Amino acid sequence: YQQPPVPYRQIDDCPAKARPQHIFYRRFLGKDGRRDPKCQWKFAVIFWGNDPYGLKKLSQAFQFGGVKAGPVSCLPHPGPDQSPITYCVYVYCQNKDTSKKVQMARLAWEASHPLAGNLQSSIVKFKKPLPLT
Amino acid sequence: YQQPPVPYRQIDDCPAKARPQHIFYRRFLGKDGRRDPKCQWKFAVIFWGNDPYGLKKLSQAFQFGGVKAGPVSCLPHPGPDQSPITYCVYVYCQNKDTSKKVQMARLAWEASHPLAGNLQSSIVKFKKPLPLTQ
Ligand SMILES: [Cl-]
Ligand SMILES: [Cl-]
Ligand SMILES: [Cl-]
């Protein structure tokens, strides 16, 4: 079964391929990236595309105190037959504002690097808080 | 990389372990289990627990026209060190009403089978629609 990505206590623990995107995010996010005990995890950003490799680096990059990305997952088949897999990554946050910021953080990264894929995305809102405390 | 659950054209195509739960969901959901082109995929139910095998059965059980579950995924480690894994499964719906019905569909199953694990769940709302059309 799938395992959650290994959390980084420091910068050097992140894989080399996802490191520059990670560094970009740590600086981009700033304070928002830090952990807030007062806020509940009821918000997330869903990223989806056809390339799991790119979503993997996004997943590996988004490992912070206030931003934690789940592993690479996928959406169910849209049709009655198996289709080309649409992969996806849920990037969980503590507040709605951080979710919007993460969404743009990717947009900033995509505009900076044309090699990166044009990921589709959406803000996610949960009714109950998730066990990430 | 992870793969999405297989879609069924008929009940006999559903995996054997998930068949008893699938047939129950097909009846309970009834008309709500069917697909609506007019509706957009902006809603979901996230189930989570410690047992991936139960969630895998749930995942395989929920495969309908208007209700489709993703594979067995998981939530990230809460702390800097590794802790016992919290597995999860998103069940995608077309409306909030159906998502509530799916949520209680499992609760009905849990009430129907005390052997089944007690899965924590929450309704999900997406700002932008998801590509599960046509
Ligand atoms: Cl990329
Ligand atoms: Cl959005
Ligand atoms: Cl809920």
Numbering used by the authors:
A (entry chain G): 1014 to 1146
B (entry chain H): 1014 to 1147
How does the study describe this entry?
The structure of the kLANA fragment comprising residues 1013–1149 was solved by X-ray crystallography at a resolution of 2.60 Å, where electron density was observed for residues 1014–1147. kLANA(1013–1149) forms dimers that are stabilized by an eight-stranded antiparallel intermolecular β-barrel to which each monomer contributes four β-strands (β1–β4). The total dimer interface area is 2080 Å2 indicating that LANA is an obligate dimer. During our crystallization trials, we obtained three different crystal forms of the kLANA CTD, all of which contained higher order oligomers. The monoclinic and orthorhombic crystals of the kLANA CTD contained pentameric rings of dimers, whereas the cubic crystals contained tetrameric rings of dimers. In all structures the oligomerization interfaces are formed by helices α1 and α3, and the interface comprises an area of approx. 500 Å2. The angles between two neighboring LANA dimers range from 0° for mLANA, 72° for the kLANA pentameric rings to 90° for the kLANA tetrameric ring. Moreover, both pentameric ring structures of kLANA dimers display ring puckering, where the interface between two dimers is oriented out of the ring plane. DNA bending has been proposed to be a prerequisite for the initiation of DNA replication and a LBS1/2 containing probe was previously shown to be bent by ∼110° when both sites were occupied. Two adjacent kLANA dimers in our monoclinic crystals are perfectly oriented to bind and bend LBS1/2 to this extent. R1119 forms a positive charge at the bottom of a cleft, which is occupied by anions in the kLANA crystals.
The KSHV latency-associated nuclear antigen (kLANA) and the MHV68 mLANA (orf73) protein are required for latent viral replication and persistence. We solved the X-ray crystal structure of the C-terminal DNA binding domains (CTD) of kLANA and MHV-68 mLANA. The C-terminal domain (CTD) of LANA forms dimers, which bind two adjacent DNA sequences, the LANA binding sites (LBS1 & LBS2) in a single TR. Importantly, kLANA and mLANA CTD dimers undergo higher order oligomerization.
